[PDB]
Design a protein around this ligand. Structure first.
Ligand SMILES: [Ca+2]
Ligand SMILES: [Ca+2]
Lengths: 87, 87
């Protein structure tokens, strides 16, 4: 009928080990937080705006092929209409 | 005629409590700032460029449906004009 931690302590006792005693650490002092996790949120956010790379490149290319075909039509506006008028 | 803090000190005295005495803290040392709040500005800014998600997705979709209808017209430029010439 050993519980979870109780069985583990039992094997540590049978192992002649004393590493399960707390040393220079208390839960009341660890309960501080110190506005932590902020680094995790910053790191995920930095990748999220780094994810904006693929978000904005699709827009850039979809705009630019249309722009370049329109620019080809504009180039036609000059080159085709140059040879159209007679002499 | 008790003032704000004076009344509170009065009830602490009647409570036989000594927790209103400063201990290991001085205002002159707390007056440091240490370029603080920088984390708050960084956190708001990171969300603001995370707010750029919705700012740029509206642009992306408004560009892309126009691009895809133009591309459908371009697909017509081929498929419709393939079956138009006679034999
Ligand atoms: Ca059990
Ligand atoms: Ca009063």
């Amino acid at each position: 009928e050993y519980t979870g931690p109780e069985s583990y302590v039992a094997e540590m006792i049978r192992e002649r080990n004393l590493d399960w005693f707390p040393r220079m650490r208390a839960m009341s002092l660890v309960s501080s937080d110190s506005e932590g996790e902020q680094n995790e949120l910053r790191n995920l956010q930095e990748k999220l705006e780094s994810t904006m790379k693929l978000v904005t490149n699709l827009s850039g290319q979809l705009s630019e092929l249309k722009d370049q075909m329109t620019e080809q039509r504009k180039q036609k506006q000059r080159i085709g209409l140059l040879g159209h008028p007679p002499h």
